[PDB]
Write a protein that holds these residues in place. Structure first.
Motif, PDB file in Angstrom:
ATOM      1  N   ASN A   8      98.917  -3.461  35.242  1.00 12.96           N
ATOM      2  CA  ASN A   8     100.361  -3.408  35.050  1.00 12.96           C
ATOM      3  C   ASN A   8     101.013  -4.774  35.213  1.00 12.96           C
ATOM      4  OD1 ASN A   8     100.277  -0.649  34.567  1.00 12.96           O
ATOM      5  ND2 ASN A   8     100.673  -0.109  36.710  1.00 12.96           N
ATOM      6  N   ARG A  29      90.025   3.362  40.319  1.00 15.22           N
ATOM      7  CA  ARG A  29      90.229   3.741  41.713  1.00 15.22           C
ATOM      8  C   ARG A  29      90.760   2.579  42.544  1.00 15.22           C
ATOM      9  NH1 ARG A  29      90.848   9.050  41.484  1.00 15.22           N
ATOM     10  NH2 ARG A  29      89.076  10.081  40.454  1.00 15.22           N
ATOM     11  N   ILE A  37     106.599  -0.158  39.468  1.00 13.78           N
ATOM     12  CA  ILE A  37     105.349  -0.707  38.952  1.00 13.78           C
ATOM     13  C   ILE A  37     104.384  -1.014  40.090  1.00 13.78           C
ATOM     14  CG2 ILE A  37     104.331  -2.534  37.555  1.00 13.78           C
ATOM     15  CD1 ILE A  37     106.032  -0.543  36.011  1.00 13.78           C
ATOM     16  N   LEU A  38     104.897  -1.499  41.223  1.00  9.47           N
ATOM     17  CA  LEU A  38     104.031  -1.768  42.367  1.00  9.47           C
ATOM     18  C   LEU A  38     103.624  -0.486  43.080  1.00  9.47           C
ATOM     19  CD1 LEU A  38     105.832  -4.901  43.871  1.00  9.47           C
ATOM     20  CD2 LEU A  38     103.716  -4.858  42.544  1.00  9.47           C
ATOM     21  N   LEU A  39     104.304   0.624  42.802  1.00  2.30           N
ATOM     22  CA  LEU A  39     104.005   1.889  43.459  1.00  2.30           C
ATOM     23  C   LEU A  39     102.973   2.724  42.716  1.00  2.30           C
ATOM     24  CD1 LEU A  39     107.570   2.952  44.655  1.00  2.30           C
ATOM     25  CD2 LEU A  39     105.705   1.950  45.996  1.00  2.30           C
ATOM     26  N   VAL A  40     102.388   2.207  41.641  1.00  2.00           N
ATOM     27  CA  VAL A  40     101.390   2.956  40.886  1.00  2.00           C
ATOM     28  C   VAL A  40     100.013   2.623  41.445  1.00  2.00           C
ATOM     29  CG1 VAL A  40     100.343   3.318  38.640  1.00  2.00           C
ATOM     30  CG2 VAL A  40     102.821   3.060  38.831  1.00  2.00           C
ATOM     31  N   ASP A  41      99.386   3.604  42.092  1.00  3.18           N
ATOM     32  CA  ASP A  41      98.087   3.410  42.723  1.00  3.18           C
ATOM     33  C   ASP A  41      96.920   3.500  41.752  1.00  3.18           C
ATOM     34  OD1 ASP A  41      96.405   3.214  45.245  1.00  3.18           O
ATOM     35  OD2 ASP A  41      95.704   5.145  44.473  1.00  3.18           O
ATOM     36  N   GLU A  42      96.928   4.471  40.841  1.00  3.11           N
ATOM     37  CA  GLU A  42      95.825   4.666  39.912  1.00  3.11           C
ATOM     38  C   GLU A  42      96.368   5.014  38.535  1.00  3.11           C
ATOM     39  OE1 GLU A  42      93.325   7.684  41.536  1.00  3.11           O
ATOM     40  OE2 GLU A  42      92.414   6.372  43.041  1.00  3.11           O
ATOM     41  N   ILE A  43      95.550   4.763  37.517  1.00  2.00           N
ATOM     42  CA  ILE A  43      95.877   5.075  36.131  1.00  2.00           C
ATOM     43  C   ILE A  43      94.850   6.086  35.642  1.00  2.00           C
ATOM     44  CG2 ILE A  43      96.053   4.210  33.784  1.00  2.00           C
ATOM     45  CD1 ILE A  43      96.947   1.519  35.006  1.00  2.00           C
ATOM     46  N   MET A  44      95.303   7.301  35.353  1.00  2.17           N
ATOM     47  CA  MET A  44      94.432   8.385  34.929  1.00  2.17           C
ATOM     48  C   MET A  44      94.756   8.796  33.499  1.00  2.17           C
ATOM     49  SD  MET A  44      94.187  10.806  38.319  1.00  2.17           S
ATOM     50  CE  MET A  44      95.954  10.901  38.599  1.00  2.17           C
ATOM     51  N   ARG A  45      93.737   9.278  32.795  1.00  2.00           N
ATOM     52  CA  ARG A  45      93.891   9.751  31.425  1.00  2.00           C
ATOM     53  C   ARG A  45      93.966  11.273  31.424  1.00  2.00           C
ATOM     54  NH1 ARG A  45      93.032   5.858  27.576  1.00  2.00           N
ATOM     55  NH2 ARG A  45      91.991   3.931  28.261  1.00  2.00           N
TER      56      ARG A  45
END
Lengths: 521, 512, 521
Positions: free
Chosen positions: C18, C10, C510-518
């Motif tokens: 990243n 979160r 790459i800087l625009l990725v807020d969260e990493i979800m599975r």
């Protein structure tokens, strides 16, 4: 490869430990910077609670767990002794110098080159202070702004308006004949059972033990001060004799015979009163330091004499300059030479105790600043603010040059250093760039404690420029650029001069430590 | 297994709030992107709020209801779906009055239902009418979906495509002005060409391939015959196949097979049409008579597709080919073109008449461009549909939510009772829409949101919204963020109804 | 706060993951940059060893374990498909953009503001590249400098001069009168049992299958080319008939009847030879793709014909355009109009097989570049160096503008960005400052691979300034600043133009990725 009971780091990790200790100490002392900063609590472990924002008190009294961070705590001790202000901004600059240098060291740069960049940038920054210093003559309006700037940081911004006129008038009273100011010419006193806003100025010296007797005059307009070191209480035989008693009744006969040494000397006090100005509209006061037998207090009270006892050695020396009478070690040598002069002498009344005021002295060449507060820790907090404000005005008078505050000089120095090329080597430029961005931490921290963005506040004051010399600073309330000269915010030249000299020497020695070795640990 | 008590309502909040917290940053033109990890290691960076929640597996049942309602919203309106879940999660985000205050749910439910009627009446006061005759005003409205897309160069053409297509489908004589895109507005793609070559075909295009080389290539006055039944030998009432093991009987069955097929095809060519369109398939023996007449063979055409052809060329639907009368003709059709376009067989029945339907032709250089132009014109047509139903616009950029939040606060002062506390919570729950627009831009949220409430108190609530790109305050009369009212009404009615549905469930029981 | 059988980050830690992925990939591919750089080994697991410095090969073929770093590998695929060079410098810039932005993000700056700084700096750097490119006409002397610059990085600096004359001469022959150039006009072949220095030009096409017969001519000075798709081997009955035989001998008698259709067609080839140029000092060649019966080989060999059979599709395609023979699918239509013309045709015998050379042609519109090497992997490394050299010369002739190399352009762009004031947002300059220091990674890496200091090399080239245009670059051998235009170091214009567009878009997402979800994992 090492000897038992020994530990050493041959790699650069020795620098990684010292830099990590400085960054940790930087975050602790950054929140208390500025008048809007938070307050730190000091718990002695026995239940005592102390509250102060002063960087010197926080580092000196508190104990730091990390060994290296304790060395920096000893630096603020020498910093507060020479100047007396800027101990908090001293640690913040050192923490940034080691943080900016760490970025270049990780690229393989040798620490010796960075240290040479600090020395070349220091000689240029000290030259910039001579240009922006103001030669304006010290007057009442200037000392108010200097005292207000120093007091607003240590208080709630309420007592600052009350304590401003107290600190300024205290120094102007002892200032004359272009004489170097002496802090020993002003003594600080504390009182309980009063509010915090009751702090005022006392023209004369305040004494603890007052005159207790119903017949004592509540106020005496004029009188001659008689200085005596001799005790009027029961003492040992001053001639050749001894105490010989065969019963309880004979022991009382020895007391009545021993009191005769005091009794004949008590009448010498009355004999002196009727001697010099024994007519109407006159008075007499006994400042005698040692104890006095209650019979002498009652006997002298009938003649309208106010007698004191249980004084301090330092106070008796201050009383001498107020009156002019010479200290008298023997009552047989009593003469008019020991008599001084004084103005209205009255007794202030608390809910419990009472103090003596010698106020309206002729030429005391000294005053007393009287602090009143409901709590004990409040008196200590105010006393720390007074001594800070006194040295601020003292430094502004001793050095006629003052410098703007509110981060106006630090932003101006960062711009001049970027346009300055190193005259020694080309690699020394990395040391100048690191020292240039290090001075900008002060206007950054002022934005955090005020609840404003760090980036937006710095860009506005940095983008402000003109074709003529202009002084821009951070406005704490609004957040927009503000001129430090127009709003009456000033600092001391000796503070900024010593700040640049101290931060360079201490941060250099940290980068010069190659290995941290444990001996006997 | 199951949950009961206050844990259900407290669990439904955390389930609906967690789903909403993901797409909070997906609102606005500056919206942040997301990353999805495929089970094989793939990464999908799409920022579309509809595709994110579609690929996420949700365990809790109420989390599924949040997704299923949003999927239904996409069918009616292809915009504002993300705003529905954000508002549905924010209205349920305050648990103070739900549990800690020990208030009964029906007391709180009555507060939302009374606040729903006030949010609707406020939007109609601050709205503005629209002139649908001027296509220039409709241009800036459609540009909301066109912006930040690759069709921005052809945007001037994209407006005329969606505008003229919906105006044909709209039937205003019934009084309800019903518009159906999924049938009359049906769109197909044409390989080859560029985006500029895309136009709006008037008619119904059929993708049926050319089976035999003998067909009518170009006709000045086409003739179309519509009939539902397939051309085949007549079978029994069952599906049982005919199995013949004798050669003498094979000649008896083959003669009956050739006779009935030739008989039905003879009555079809009696009118001498140019084409035969059947609903079901066509056998091989029936195509032999169709190629002999030099006419086009078309099959596999559904009922809705045939209903549009009858009103176009003046055709008539007949049950069986033997009952075909002279009433079924293609008289009035402009042209008939079977010519291959983009290496694919097309059929143009197009004419000068408006049979409450049309066909959109998508030209493009590659299939990657066709997929981009298609989905960009789809929602654009739904924007045209929503405006023609209710020609009223409301200020966007957060000005609509703040204008309603100011009316709820002033009216709550006259409300006396325990329902005033949850009634005011709706006014503060609508502030999440302008909040996410500022947070995505990077500007301070508290400083701008506080000054925004002072503008709606003094100045007019119809203006002074929030600029998404710049981050400062700007009036909505000077900017094109004006949105249709039918979208905002459906958004608030769905956000409140979904929040009420989750509060009404106090128990989760498993059984069948 | 997540669903079971999945994971989500979160906080901003999803951005830190990243950034660590790009920094890890930056350190792997930074050692292969420049000719002085090292080489990476590719082990397929089956025992195959591959050695190449090409960034596109070290990424597309090698599967990366980390998920995020696999996205950048797909970017270099589209990067090599357009320009054909710069895949290594592409990853190095992306890694530095994310590294420099991490300093400002940790201070509380939102990523969107930094991304806006990249867009403003991209336009300024793109317009500055307009003045740097040189419009000089492309000649043989310039194409050699472009060929040497591209080849010196992919070889040992030995085969360079050997491959230099092979690449330049192949491009000049296939393009005349501003005609669009196609690299499919050049064929690449590989032979074994020869030294790596034996690579030379082939004017014609190299054919795989040769002629088999003792009387086949080893060389034919002049001859005509007849293109045929017809198979001269055994074939079934062409007319309508069946197999009628009373024994195994009668079935073989129908074979001669079926072969009569083919045998009569073999005579037609002999007839056409004697009709058109059947006298002395002439010849004929059968390029027929399908097989030919051994008995038909004997009849054609006695006339001086060099037969061919069992050819490929790409071979007959080039033989059609080079020679001019029209494809003939039936010998009943055989006519002299379908005959072509060719020069000396000879078969060079290797240590194992024999290949046919059609060379000495007037304007075949096709050539071949023959590579020779001792091993298999050496042939693969040279084949990659040739195609990388062809696209370097193709882009130089197509776009008449070329830019200096050796990091001269990247340093020149970094200076114009620092002197550029923000044209859009006040806080957007932090992104411009980060993008300016990121363009300096190119001269830094060239200093590490050369074995010199990173800081001393960069300071010298930045210290070069004058009134007129001055462009200096890193010299690998000496280390002093060197002008790339004078020493013949040049790069393509489309390569430097594409890096600015590619490094800006990828580092932004790459800087625009807020969260990493599975999802389903």
């Amino acid at each position: 490869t090492l000897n038992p009971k020994a530990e050493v780091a041959r790699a650069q990790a020795a620098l990684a430990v010292n830099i990590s200790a400085a960054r940790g100490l930087q975050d602790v002392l950054r929140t208390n910077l500025g008048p809007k900063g938070t307050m730190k609590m000091l718990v002695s472990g026995a239940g005592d609670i102390k509250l102060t924002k002063d960087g010197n008190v926080l580092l000196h009294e508190m104990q730091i767990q990390h060994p290296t961070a304790s060395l920096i705590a000893k630096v603020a001790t020498a910093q507060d002794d020479i100047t007396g202000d800027g101990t908090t901004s001293n640690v913040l600059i050192i923490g940034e110098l080691l943080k900016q240098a760490d970025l270049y060291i990780s690229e393989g740069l040798h620490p010796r080159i960075i240290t040479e960049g600090f020395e070349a940038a220091k000689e240029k920054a000290l030259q910039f202070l001579e240009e922006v210093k103001v030669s304006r003559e010290m007057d009442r309006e200037t000392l108010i702004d200097v005292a207000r700037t120093s007091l607003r940081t240590k208080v709630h911004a309420e007592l600052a308006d009350v304590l401003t006129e107290a600190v300024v008038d205290s120094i102007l009273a002892i200032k004359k004949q272009d004489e170097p100011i002496d802090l020993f010419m002003i003594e600080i006193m504390e009182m309980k059972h009063k509010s915090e806003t009751d702090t005022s100025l006392i023209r004369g010296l305040v004494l603890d033990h007052g005159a207790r007797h119903p017949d004592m005059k509540k106020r005496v307009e004029d009188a001659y001060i008689l200085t005596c070191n001799v005790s009027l209480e029961y003492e040992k035989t001053e001639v050749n004799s001894g105490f010989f008693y065969k019963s309880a009744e004979e022991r009382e006969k020895l007391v009545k015979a021993e009191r005769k040494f005091i009794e004949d000397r008590v009448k010498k006090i009355i004999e002196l009163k009727r001697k010099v100005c024994g007519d109407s509209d006159k008075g007499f006061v006994v400042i005698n330091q040692k104890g006095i037998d209650p019979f002498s207090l009652d006997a002298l009270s009938k003649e309208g004499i106010v007698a004191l006892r249980r004084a301090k050695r330092r106070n008796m020396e201050r009383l001498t300059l107020a009156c002019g009478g010479v200290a008298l070690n023997s009552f047989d040598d009593l003469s008019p030479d020991c008599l001084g002069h004084a103005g209205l002498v009255y007794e202030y009344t608390l809910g419990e105790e009472k103090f003596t005021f010698i106020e309206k002295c002729n030429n005391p060449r000294s005053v007393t600043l009287l602090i009143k507060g409901p709590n004990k820790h409040t008196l200590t907090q105010i006393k720390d603010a007074v001594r800070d404000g006194l040295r601020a005005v003292k430094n502004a008078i001793d050095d006629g040059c003052v410098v703007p505050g509110a981060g106006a000089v630090e932003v101006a120095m960062a711009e001049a250093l970027i346009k300055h090329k190193p005259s020694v080597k080309g690699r020394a430029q990395l040391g100048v760039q690191a020292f240039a961005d290090a001075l900008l931490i002060i206007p950054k921290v002022l934005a955090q404690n005020s609840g404003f963005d760090l980036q937006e506040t710095l860009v506005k004051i940095q983008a402000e420029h003109s074709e003529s010399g202009q002084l821009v600073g951070v406005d704490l309330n609004t957040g927009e650029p503000m001129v430090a000269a127009e709003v009456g915010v000033w600092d001391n030249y000796c503070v900024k001069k010593q700040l640049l000299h101290s931060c360079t020497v201490i941060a250099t020695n940290i980068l010069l430590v190659d290995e941290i070795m444990r001996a006997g640990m | 297994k199951r949950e009961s008590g206050r844990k259900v309502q407290s669990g439904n909040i955390n389930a609906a709030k967690t789903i909403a917290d993901i797409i909070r940053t997906c609102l606005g033109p500056k919206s942040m992107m997301k990353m999805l990890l495929d089970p094989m290691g793939g990464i999908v960076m799409t920022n579309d709020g509809n595709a994110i929640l579609r690929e996420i597996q949700v365990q809790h049942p109420a989390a599924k209801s949040m997704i299923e309602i949003s999927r239904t919203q996409d069918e009616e309106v292809g915009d504002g779906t993300t705003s529905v879940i954000i508002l549905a999660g924010e209205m349920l985000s305050v648990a103070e009055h739900f549990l800690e205050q020990q208030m009964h749910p029906t007391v709180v439910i009555s507060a939302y239902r009374k606040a729903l009627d006030d949010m609707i009446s406020t939007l109609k006061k601050i709205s503005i009418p629209v002139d649908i005759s001027d296509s220039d005003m409709m241009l800036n409205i459609i540009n909301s979906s066109i912006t930040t897309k690759a069709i921005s160069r052809w945007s001037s053409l994209a407006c005329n495509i969606a505008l003229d297509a919906v105006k044909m489908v709209q039937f205003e004589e019934n009084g309800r002005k019903e518009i159906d895109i999924k049938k009359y507005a049906r769109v197909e793609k044409i390989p080859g060409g560029i985006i500029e070559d895309s136009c709006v075909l008037r008619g119904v295009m059929i993708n049926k391939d050319v089976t035999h080389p003998r067909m009518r290539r170009y006709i000045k006055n086409p003739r179309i015959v519509l009939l539902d039944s397939s051309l085949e030998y007549k079978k029994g009432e069952s599906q049982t196949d005919i199995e013949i093991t004798r050669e003498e009987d094979f000649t008896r069955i083959l003669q009956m097979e050739e006779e009935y097929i030739q008989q039905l095809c003879e009555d079809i060519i009696q009118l001498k049409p140019d084409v035969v369109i059947t609903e079901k398939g066509i056998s091989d023996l029936a195509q032999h008579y169709l190629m002999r007449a030099n006419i086009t063979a078309i099959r596999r055409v559904r009922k809705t597709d045939n209903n549009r052809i009858a009103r176009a060329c003046g055709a008539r639907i007949v049950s069986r080919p033997e009952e075909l009368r002279e009433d079924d003709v293609g008289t009035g059709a402009g042209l008939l073109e079977i010519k291959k376009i983009g290496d694919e067989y097309f059929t143009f029945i197009t004419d000068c008449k408006d049979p409450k339907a049309c066909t959109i032709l998508l030209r493009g250089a590659s299939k990657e461009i066709l997929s981009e132009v298609e989905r960009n014109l789809q929602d654009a047509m739904q924007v045209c549909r929503n405006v023609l139903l209710d020609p009223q616009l409301v200020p966007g950029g957060g000005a609509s939510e703040m204008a309603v939040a100011h009316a709820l606060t002033e009216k709550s002062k006259a409300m006396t009772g325990v329902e005033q506390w949850p009634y005011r919570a709706v006014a503060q729950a609508l502030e999440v829409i302008p909040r996410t627009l500022i947070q995505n831009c990077g500007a301070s949220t508290i400083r701008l949101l506080t000054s925004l409430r002072a503008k709606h108190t003094q100045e007019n609530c119809e203006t002074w919204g929030v600029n998404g790109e710049t981050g400062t305050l700007v009036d909505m009369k000077e900017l094109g963020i004006w949105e249709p009212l039918a979208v905002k009404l459906q958004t608030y009615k769905t956000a409140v109804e979904t929040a009420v549905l989750l509060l009404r469930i106090d128990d989760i029981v498993s059984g069948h």
